[PDB]
Amino acid sequence: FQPSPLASQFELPGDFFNLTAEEIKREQRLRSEAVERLSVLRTKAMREKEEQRGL
């Protein structure tokens, strides 16, 4: 294949960097869930059931 220098020339919309209510609430929910997951008292079997989902 031959790359074309023109593929790297693109200008973003001005509103690109303005995050929505769903994007901001999603991140804050994940922050609360991440702290909760670190606090959870669970056995190795429950830990593996989640980790194994990516294999």
Partner 1 sequence: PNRLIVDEAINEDNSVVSLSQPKMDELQLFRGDTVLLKGKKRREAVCIVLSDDTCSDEKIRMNRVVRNNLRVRLGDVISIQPCPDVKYGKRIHVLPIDDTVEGITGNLFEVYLKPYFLEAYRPIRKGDIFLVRGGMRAVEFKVVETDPSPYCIVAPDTVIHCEGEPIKREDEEESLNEVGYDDIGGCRKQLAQIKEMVELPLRHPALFKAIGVKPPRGILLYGPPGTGKTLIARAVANETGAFFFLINGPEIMSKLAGESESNLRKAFEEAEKNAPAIIFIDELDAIAPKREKTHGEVERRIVSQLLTLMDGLKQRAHVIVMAATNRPNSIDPALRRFGRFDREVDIGIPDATGRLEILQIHTKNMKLADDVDLEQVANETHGHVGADLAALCSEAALQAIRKKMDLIDLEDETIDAEVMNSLAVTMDDFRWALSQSNPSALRETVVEVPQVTWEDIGGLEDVKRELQELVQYPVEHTPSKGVLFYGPPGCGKTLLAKAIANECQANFISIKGPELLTMWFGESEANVREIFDKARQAAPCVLFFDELDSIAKARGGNIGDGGGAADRVINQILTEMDGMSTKKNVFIIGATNRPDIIDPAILRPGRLDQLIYIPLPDEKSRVAILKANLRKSPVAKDVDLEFLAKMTNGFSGADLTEICQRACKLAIRESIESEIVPEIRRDHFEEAMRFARRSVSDNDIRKYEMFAQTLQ
Does residue 32 bind partner 1 (CB under 8 A)?
yes
> What is the C-alpha to C-alpha distance for residues 26 and 34, in angstroms, rounded to an integer?
12
CB of 12 to partner 1, least distance (A): 6
> What is the C-alpha to C-alpha distance for residues 4 and 32, in angstroms, rounded to an integer?
44
> What is the C-alpha to C-alpha distance for residues 15 and 18, in angstroms, rounded to an integer?
5
CB of 4 to partner 1, least distance (A): 7
Binding residues for partner 1, rule: CB under 8 A, are 1, 3-5, 7-8, 10, 12, 16-17, 19, 23-24, 27-28, 30-32, 34-35, 38-47, 54
